[PDB]
Design an enzyme around this catalytic site. Structure first.
Site, PDB file in Angstrom:
ATOM      1  N   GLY B  15       0.960  -1.148   0.020  1.00 15.50           N
ATOM      2  CA  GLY B  15      -0.098  -0.109   0.175  1.00 15.50           C
ATOM      3  C   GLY B  15       0.724   1.263   0.017  1.00 15.50           C
ATOM      4  O   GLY B  15       0.319   2.340   0.360  1.00 15.50           O
ATOM      5  N   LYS B  16       2.083   1.105  -0.407  1.00 16.85           N
ATOM      6  CA  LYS B  16       2.910   2.526  -0.273  1.00 16.85           C
ATOM      7  C   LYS B  16       2.553   3.329  -1.222  1.00 16.85           C
ATOM      8  O   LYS B  16       2.129   4.613  -0.633  1.00 16.85           O
ATOM      9  CB  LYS B  16       4.282   2.093  -0.856  1.00 16.85           C
ATOM     10  CG  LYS B  16       5.232   1.163  -0.100  1.00 16.85           C
ATOM     11  CD  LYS B  16       6.888   1.154  -0.958  1.00 16.85           C
ATOM     12  CE  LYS B  16       6.703   0.670  -2.209  1.00 16.85           C
ATOM     13  NZ  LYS B  16       6.253  -0.694  -2.190  1.00 16.85           N
ATOM     14  N   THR B  17       1.901   3.118  -2.342  1.00 20.46           N
ATOM     15  CA  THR B  17       1.523   4.137  -3.405  1.00 20.46           C
ATOM     16  C   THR B  17       0.062   4.889  -2.927  1.00 20.46           C
ATOM     17  O   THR B  17      -0.015   5.950  -2.686  1.00 20.46           O
ATOM     18  CB  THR B  17       1.036   3.547  -4.609  1.00 20.46           C
ATOM     19  OG1 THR B  17       2.330   2.955  -5.136  1.00 20.46           O
ATOM     20  CG2 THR B  17       0.566   4.753  -5.617  1.00 20.46           C
ATOM     21  N   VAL B  18      -0.892   3.928  -2.391  1.00 21.91           N
ATOM     22  CA  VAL B  18      -2.158   4.573  -1.698  1.00 21.91           C
ATOM     23  C   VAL B  18      -1.678   5.325  -0.440  1.00 21.91           C
ATOM     24  O   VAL B  18      -2.516   6.318  -0.299  1.00 21.91           O
ATOM     25  CB  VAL B  18      -3.057   3.423  -1.529  1.00 21.91           C
ATOM     26  CG1 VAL B  18      -4.197   3.754  -0.909  1.00 21.91           C
ATOM     27  CG2 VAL B  18      -3.355   2.574  -2.610  1.00 21.91           C
ATOM     28  N   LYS B  38       8.817   9.414  -8.114  1.00 24.75           N
ATOM     29  CA  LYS B  38       8.952   7.946  -8.003  1.00 24.75           C
ATOM     30  C   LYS B  38       9.996   7.538  -9.079  1.00 24.75           C
ATOM     31  O   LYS B  38       9.934   7.658 -10.114  1.00 24.75           O
ATOM     32  CB  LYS B  38       7.710   7.628  -8.913  1.00 24.75           C
ATOM     33  CG  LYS B  38       7.707   5.965  -9.182  1.00 24.75           C
ATOM     34  CD  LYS B  38       7.451   5.068  -8.005  1.00 24.75           C
ATOM     35  CE  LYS B  38       7.380   3.758  -8.086  1.00 24.75           C
ATOM     36  NZ  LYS B  38       7.041   2.822  -7.096  1.00 24.75           N
ATOM     37  N   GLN B  41      10.532   3.284 -11.711  1.00 21.83           N
ATOM     38  CA  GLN B  41       8.993   2.743 -11.934  1.00 21.83           C
ATOM     39  C   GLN B  41       9.198   1.323 -12.754  1.00 21.83           C
ATOM     40  O   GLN B  41       9.608   1.701 -13.980  1.00 21.83           O
ATOM     41  CB  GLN B  41       8.066   3.798 -12.385  1.00 21.83           C
ATOM     42  CG  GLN B  41       6.751   3.119 -12.812  1.00 21.83           C
ATOM     43  CD  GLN B  41       5.819   2.758 -11.853  1.00 21.83           C
ATOM     44  OE1 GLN B  41       5.268   3.638 -10.924  1.00 21.83           O
ATOM     45  NE2 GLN B  41       5.590   1.514 -11.852  1.00 21.83           N
ATOM     46  N   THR B  42       8.745   0.161 -12.286  1.00 22.88           N
ATOM     47  CA  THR B  42       8.727  -0.828 -13.060  1.00 22.88           C
ATOM     48  C   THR B  42       7.327  -1.396 -13.218  1.00 22.88           C
ATOM     49  O   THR B  42       6.400  -0.847 -12.810  1.00 22.88           O
ATOM     50  CB  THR B  42       9.536  -2.195 -12.580  1.00 22.88           C
ATOM     51  OG1 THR B  42       8.775  -2.647 -11.292  1.00 22.88           O
ATOM     52  CG2 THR B  42      10.964  -1.892 -11.885  1.00 22.88           C
TER      53      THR B  42
HETATM   54  N1  LIG Z   1      -5.909   1.304   2.131  1.00 22.67           N
HETATM   55  C1  LIG Z   1      -5.523   0.478   0.800  1.00 22.67           C
HETATM   56  C2  LIG Z   1      -4.088  -0.009   0.507  1.00 22.67           C
HETATM   57  C3  LIG Z   1      -3.772  -0.785  -0.782  1.00 22.67           C
HETATM   58  N2  LIG Z   1      -4.929  -0.861  -1.728  1.00 22.67           N
HETATM   59  C4  LIG Z   1      -4.702  -1.460  -2.908  1.00 22.67           C
HETATM   60  O1  LIG Z   1      -3.746  -2.739  -2.468  1.00 22.67           O
HETATM   61  C5  LIG Z   1      -2.752  -2.688  -3.521  1.00 22.67           C
HETATM   62  C6  LIG Z   1      -1.445  -2.115  -2.893  1.00 22.67           C
HETATM   63  O2  LIG Z   1      -1.434  -0.793  -3.042  1.00 22.67           O
HETATM   64  P1  LIG Z   1       0.074  -0.180  -3.437  1.00 22.67           P
HETATM   65  O3  LIG Z   1       0.182   1.275  -2.674  1.00 22.67           O
HETATM   66  O4  LIG Z   1       0.005  -0.367  -4.970  1.00 22.67           O
HETATM   67  O5  LIG Z   1       0.891  -1.226  -2.565  1.00 22.67           O
HETATM   68  P2  LIG Z   1       2.744  -1.031  -2.935  1.00 22.67           P
HETATM   69  O6  LIG Z   1       3.750  -1.250  -1.787  1.00 22.67           O
HETATM   70  O7  LIG Z   1       2.865   0.675  -3.335  1.00 22.67           O
HETATM   71  O8  LIG Z   1       2.984  -1.556  -4.262  1.00 22.67           O
HETATM   72  P3  LIG Z   1       4.111  -1.698  -5.126  1.00 22.67           P
HETATM   73  O9  LIG Z   1       5.182  -2.488  -4.316  1.00 22.67           O
HETATM   74  O10 LIG Z   1       4.028  -2.199  -6.348  1.00 22.67           O
HETATM   75  O11 LIG Z   1       4.871  -0.397  -5.124  1.00 22.67           O
HETATM   76  C7  LIG Z   1      -3.119  -1.653  -4.827  1.00 22.67           C
HETATM   77  O12 LIG Z   1      -4.045  -2.280  -5.636  1.00 22.67           O
HETATM   78  C8  LIG Z   1      -3.925  -0.797  -4.084  1.00 22.67           C
HETATM   79  O13 LIG Z   1      -5.228  -0.369  -5.063  1.00 22.67           O
HETATM   80  C9  LIG Z   1      -6.347  -0.113  -1.629  1.00 22.67           C
HETATM   81  O14 LIG Z   1      -7.154  -0.349  -2.303  1.00 22.67           O
HETATM   82  N3  LIG Z   1      -6.550   0.538  -0.232  1.00 22.67           N
HETATM   83 MG   LIG Z   2       3.107   1.078  -5.642  1.00 21.07          MG
END
Ligand SMILES: Nc1ccn([C@@H]2O[C@H](COP(=O)(O)OP(=O)(O)OP(=O)(O)O)[C@@H](O)[C@H]2O)c(=O)n1
Ligand SMILES: [Mg+2]
Ligand SMILES: Nc1ccn([C@@H]2O[C@H](COP(=O)(O)OP(=O)(O)OP(=O)(O)O)[C@@H](O)[C@H]2O)c(=O)n1
Ligand SMILES: [Mg+2]
Lengths: 226, 227
Positions: B15-18, B38, B41-42
């Site tokens: 959930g880092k992005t969120v 960012k 980005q892969t």
């Molecule tokens: N409170 C939250 C946390 C996560 N997600 C969902 O779970 C997944 C993970 O969120 P993301 O931020 O993409 O995790 P990251 O660590 O950022 O992913 P990555 O390692 O690829 O960067 C996404 O599909 C996102 O839509 C969500 O809907 N609501």
């Molecule tokens: Mg992410």
């Protein structure tokens, strides 16, 4: 003393127990005497019992444990839920040092990852490994993220000068896939990959498991352990 | 300068992005100017674009990328598979420094977990944090294993004298089971828990995501992020 190895993993469900059993079988087939200690076991209500798996798969009979919690939670949570403390640090360290002897490979299986709490007050498999001068065998996955998790664990190992005996990939998928193959090469760029256990080996019978295990580790390394 | 947070996590998919989007939204509604960066980005060949997703949920318009690889792999591997190279450490830090501005909160989202390689040789987001003097916000799960991974991450942060700005539970299930509840209460003893974003937050539209975002964080902590 003999050889004490703690068998840790980058997380829960990476096949630490199956690796203990596999190394056990290999070492026994090398004529080494093996003991396995699992100080704390959780999940007993649903039949979690990793020492039994080592007994079944590898034929180890020196199987040592101190506490069993019904709940499938982390040891300290399971303790809290059940209403009872964890064992003390001293109990774990002396159970292990009393198991250790000349000629014996003593495997110590923790619960979950390296920093999970194993005894009162907040002592971990890493602490235990320090107290007994054990090296650490790190069980890893081949999945996306394994690199980060491996480096994190190896870094924590080094912070307390626990030597790293190597990594084992707990479960090698079939067919592999691009990510798992690339990760295998990278893992070998950070530590000696000792083995990769075929996915599904857990369900083998003891004979087939012994053959798998024999072929999974380098024989010279296994012999060279004790 | 302003304030820089690297927003890292205990692994990939937590959930880092969120969280970048949620903290950005709460900070925007506090009147703070926000940039999100960012550098690596892969998975672009699969339509992965974390900057775009931050813009879509939060309205952030100051989005900065640098390196983009098609395959959904480790950056090192995605670069090797594209026939390309990783950026240099100074390329990443330059990208970040040009964003830094007094009064601005600059979030720096990594590729995967804290020790993933971003630049040759074995340069990670932890090193980048030391270079730009940033603090690290660690996104965690509530699932079994999160305590070990979290402690490993914090310990690796203190190894190079990188300050921990607190934890954020990326996805918080409603209702919480026994393991989730226990992990939450232990996490609060390991570090300041800044927020626990409700599960499925990526489905909320602009207004729902902004409401959730403002409630998620303490208003006073967000405002105190930037003088
Ligand atoms: N409170 C939250 C946390 C996560 N997600 C969902 O779970 C997944 C993970 O969120 P993301 O931020 O993409 O995790 P990251 O660590 O950022 O992913 P990555 O390692 O690829 O960067 C996404 O599909 C996102 O839509 C969500 O809907 N609501
Ligand atoms: Mg992410
Ligand atoms: N080559 C392998 C490795 C593991 N397993 C299975 O993978 C699962 C988890 O592996 P396990 O040996 O239980 O290791 P642990 O890391 O000890 O799990 P935990 O610490 O969380 O209890 C088990 O069902 C085990 O039967 C398998 O089938 N084939
Ligand atoms: Mg186990």
């Amino acid at each position: 003393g003999g050889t004490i190895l703690v068998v840790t993993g980058t997380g829960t469900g990476v096949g630490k127990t199956v690796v203990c059993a596999a190394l056990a079988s290999a070492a026994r087939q090398a004529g080494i005497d093996v003991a396995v200690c699992k100080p704390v076991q959780t999940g007993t209500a649903r039949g979690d019992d990793d020492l039994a798996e080592v007994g079944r798969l590898a034929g180890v009979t020196q199987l040592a444990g101190l506490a069993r919690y019904p709940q499938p939670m982390a040891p300290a949570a399971a303790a809290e839920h059940a209403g009872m403390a964890l064992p003390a640090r001293d109990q774990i360290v002396r159970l292990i040092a009393d198991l250790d002897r000349p000629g014996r490979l003593t495997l110590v299986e923790g619960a979950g990852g390296l920093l999970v709490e194993l005894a009162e007050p907040g002592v971990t498999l890493r602490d235990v490994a320090v107290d007994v001068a054990a090296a650490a065998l790190v069980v890893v996955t081949a999945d996306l993220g394994t690199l980060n998790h491996t480096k994190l664990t190896l870094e924590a190992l080094a912070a307390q000068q626990v030597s790293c005996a190597g990594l084992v990939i707990g479960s090698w998928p079939d067919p592999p896939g691009l990510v798992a193959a690339s990760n295998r090469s990278a893992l070998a760029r950070i530590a000696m990959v000792r083995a990769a256990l075929p996915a599904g080996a857990a369900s083998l019978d003891a004979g087939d498991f012994a053959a798998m295990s024999a072929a999974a580790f380098d024989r010279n390394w296994v012999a060279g352990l004790v």
